[PDB]
Design an enzyme around this catalytic site. Structure first.
Site, PDB file in Angstrom:
ATOM      1  N   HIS A  53       0.835  -1.154   0.000  1.00 24.03           N
ATOM      2  CA  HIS A  53       0.000   0.000   0.000  1.00 24.03           C
ATOM      3  C   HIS A  53       0.914   1.263   0.000  1.00 24.03           C
ATOM      4  O   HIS A  53       2.085   1.149   0.050  1.00 24.03           O
ATOM      5  CB  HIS A  53      -0.892   0.032   1.217  1.00 24.03           C
TER       6      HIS A  53
ATOM      7  N   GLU B 277       6.095   8.848   5.075  1.00 21.33           N
ATOM      8  CA  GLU B 277       6.158   8.647   6.512  1.00 21.33           C
ATOM      9  C   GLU B 277       7.583   8.789   7.016  1.00 21.33           C
ATOM     10  O   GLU B 277       7.855   9.588   7.913  1.00 21.33           O
ATOM     11  CB  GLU B 277       5.594   7.271   6.861  1.00 21.33           C
TER      12      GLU B 277
ATOM     13  N   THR C 215       0.451   2.358  11.480  1.00 19.07           N
ATOM     14  CA  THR C 215      -0.956   2.571  11.797  1.00 19.07           C
ATOM     15  C   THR C 215      -1.355   1.701  12.974  1.00 19.07           C
ATOM     16  O   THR C 215      -0.709   0.683  13.234  1.00 19.07           O
ATOM     17  CB  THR C 215      -1.839   2.241  10.586  1.00 19.07           C
TER      18      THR C 215
ATOM     19  N   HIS D 145       4.891   0.862   0.798  1.00 18.40           N
ATOM     20  CA  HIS D 145       5.235  -0.138   1.814  1.00 18.40           C
ATOM     21  C   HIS D 145       4.862  -1.513   1.297  1.00 18.40           C
ATOM     22  O   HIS D 145       3.676  -1.799   1.122  1.00 18.40           O
ATOM     23  CB  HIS D 145       4.491   0.148   3.117  1.00 18.40           C
TER      24      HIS D 145
HETATM   25  N1  LIG Z   1       2.070   1.190   7.372  1.00 21.20           N
HETATM   26  S1  LIG Z   1       2.847  -0.276   7.703  1.00 21.20           S
HETATM   27  O1  LIG Z   1       3.751  -0.097   8.846  1.00 21.20           O
HETATM   28  O2  LIG Z   1       3.632  -0.784   6.562  1.00 21.20           O
HETATM   29  C1  LIG Z   1       1.622  -1.516   8.105  1.00 21.20           C
HETATM   30  C2  LIG Z   1       0.638  -1.168   9.020  1.00 21.20           C
HETATM   31  C3  LIG Z   1      -0.320  -2.106   9.346  1.00 21.20           C
HETATM   32  C4  LIG Z   1      -0.246  -3.371   8.770  1.00 21.20           C
HETATM   33  N2  LIG Z   1      -1.271  -4.319   9.156  1.00 21.20           N
HETATM   34  S2  LIG Z   1      -2.253  -5.053   7.996  1.00 21.20           S
HETATM   35  O3  LIG Z   1      -1.417  -5.698   6.993  1.00 21.20           O
HETATM   36  O4  LIG Z   1      -3.030  -6.116   8.654  1.00 21.20           O
HETATM   37  C5  LIG Z   1      -3.289  -3.791   7.169  1.00 21.20           C
HETATM   38  C6  LIG Z   1      -4.281  -3.149   8.130  1.00 21.20           C
HETATM   39  N3  LIG Z   1      -5.499  -3.928   8.104  1.00 21.20           N
HETATM   40  C7  LIG Z   1      -5.748  -4.888   9.167  1.00 21.20           C
HETATM   41  O5  LIG Z   1      -4.967  -5.011  10.051  1.00 21.20           O
HETATM   42  N4  LIG Z   1      -6.975  -5.672   9.110  1.00 21.20           N
HETATM   43  C8  LIG Z   1      -7.337  -6.665  10.120  1.00 21.20           C
HETATM   44  C9  LIG Z   1      -8.015  -7.806   9.704  1.00 21.20           C
HETATM   45  C10 LIG Z   1      -8.386  -8.784  10.619  1.00 21.20           C
HETATM   46  C11 LIG Z   1      -8.075  -8.618  11.967  1.00 21.20           C
HETATM   47  F1  LIG Z   1      -8.440  -9.583  12.873  1.00 21.20           F
HETATM   48  C12 LIG Z   1      -7.399  -7.478  12.385  1.00 21.20           C
HETATM   49  C13 LIG Z   1      -7.036  -6.496  11.467  1.00 21.20           C
HETATM   50  C14 LIG Z   1       0.745  -3.755   7.864  1.00 21.20           C
HETATM   51  C15 LIG Z   1       1.694  -2.793   7.551  1.00 21.20           C
HETATM   52 ZN   LIG Z   2       2.330   1.719   5.481  1.00 21.45          ZN
END
Ligand SMILES: NS(=O)(=O)c1ccc(NS(=O)(=O)CCNC(=O)Nc2ccc(F)cc2)cc1
Ligand SMILES: [Zn+2]
Ligand SMILES: NS(=O)(=O)c1ccc(NS(=O)(=O)CCNC(=O)Nc2ccc(F)cc2)cc1
Ligand SMILES: NS(=O)(=O)c1ccc(NS(=O)(=O)CCNC(=O)Nc2ccc(F)cc2)cc1
EC number: 4.2.1.1
Length: 257
Positions: A91, A103, A196, A116
């Site tokens: 993303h 970021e 996030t 990312h």
């Molecule tokens: N910005 S970063 O540091 O690269 C970054 C930040 C966050 C993530 N986490 S993520 O991939 O899961 C996308 C966000 N969506 C969810 O978490 N959904 C979800 C689904 C089912 C659940 F039970 C709980 C949550 C990965 C990389």
């Molecule tokens: Zn990210």
């Protein structure tokens, strides 16, 4: 519920996610004169030849392109990493203006956006287990600057009107993420967190030195997405970036001189 707005943006997150004030939060400013060259760092191994993208999702915060991670198909190895990490999604984070959006920052420089590529360590079996571990994830961060178009980004750009609002998804197969990489894989690396909520401190960050250039029209189309769901008040998906957090007791290492 958290977001990037006036009343629920990054400065509010600590109230529901107290690790927001933790010891290894991301992103950070990369001070290029304080980062140490580390000759024990290996070249990165990006093995995306067999990647299987499946779909693209507007989740109200960004748009994620998801991959099949049930086999070693698209993996990140080498660099600072021990073992094999599988690509699960990518993303971006971007600004309302070309002068902001990334970021991470480089000597306080903000890029127009930041990509990312998110990978999880296969020794933990699945992504949900991996995010509970201090070496659970490896995120490859790539800066975007506004210049010439990035041909390999255009398939992403053109599907965005079909996922304009939160909760919309579209099929997105046969996308090759190698078209988003710069020429050089020189990088900086430090231990950090998700940027996030829930802001878990599970990420080995690998941030490439060389940005990719995208066109003004390409990033303008990111800015036409909506944070809101269909039928809700329209709020443009822009400035979905967390600002730099305190580096605290961490060193950023450079793979290059
Ligand atoms: N910005 S970063 O540091 O690269 C970054 C930040 C966050 C993530 N986490 S993520 O991939 O899961 C996308 C966000 N969506 C969810 O978490 N959904 C979800 C689904 C089912 C659940 F039970 C709980 C949550 C990965 C990389
Ligand atoms: Zn990210
Ligand atoms: N601490 S937080 O998750 O960012 C957060 C920030 C603001 C609210 N306010 S409200 O919109 O829910 C009513 C809720 C959660
Ligand atoms: N390979 S696939 O099935 O097609 C596939 C399936 C789902 C995705 N979405 S995702 O990348 O965003 C990962 C979100 N899943 C989580 O569990 N998140 C989470 C975060 C924080 C926690 F504390 C707990 C859970 C991508 C590809």
């Amino acid at each position: 519920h958290w977001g990037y707005g006036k009343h629920n943006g990054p400065e509010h997150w600590h109230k529901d996610f107290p690790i927001a004030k933790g010891e290894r939060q991301s992103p950070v400013d990369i001070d290029t004169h304080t980062a140490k060259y580390d000759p024990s760092l290996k070249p990165l191994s990006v093995s995306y030849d067999q990647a299987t993208s499946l779909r693209i999702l507007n989740n109200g915060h960004a748009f994620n392109v998801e991959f099949d991670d049930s086999q070693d198909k698209a993996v990140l190895k080498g660099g600072p990493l021990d073992g094999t990490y599988r690509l699960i999604q990518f993303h971006f984070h971007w600004g309302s203006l070309d002068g902001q959006g990334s970021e991470h920052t480089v000597d306080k420089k903000k890029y127009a956006a930041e990509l990312h590529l998110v990978h999880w360590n296969t020794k933990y079996g699945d992504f949900g287990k991996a995010v509970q571990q201090p070496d659970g994830l490896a995120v490859l961060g790539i800066f975007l600057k506004v210049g010439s178009a990035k041909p390999g980004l255009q398939k992403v750009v053109d599907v965005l009107d079909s996922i304009k609002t939160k909760g919309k998804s579209a099929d997105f197969t046969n996308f090759d993420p190698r078209g988003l990489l710069p020429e050089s894989l020189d990088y900086w690396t430090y231990p950090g967190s998700l940027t996030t909520p829930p802001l878990l401190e599970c990420v080995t960050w690998i941030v490439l030195k060389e940005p990719i250039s995208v066109s003004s029209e390409q990033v303008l189309k990111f800015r036409k997405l909506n944070f809101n769901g269909e039928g809700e008040p329209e709020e443009l998906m822009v400035d979905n970036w967390r600002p730099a957090q305190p580096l605290k007791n961490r060193q950023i290492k450079a793979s290059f001189k």
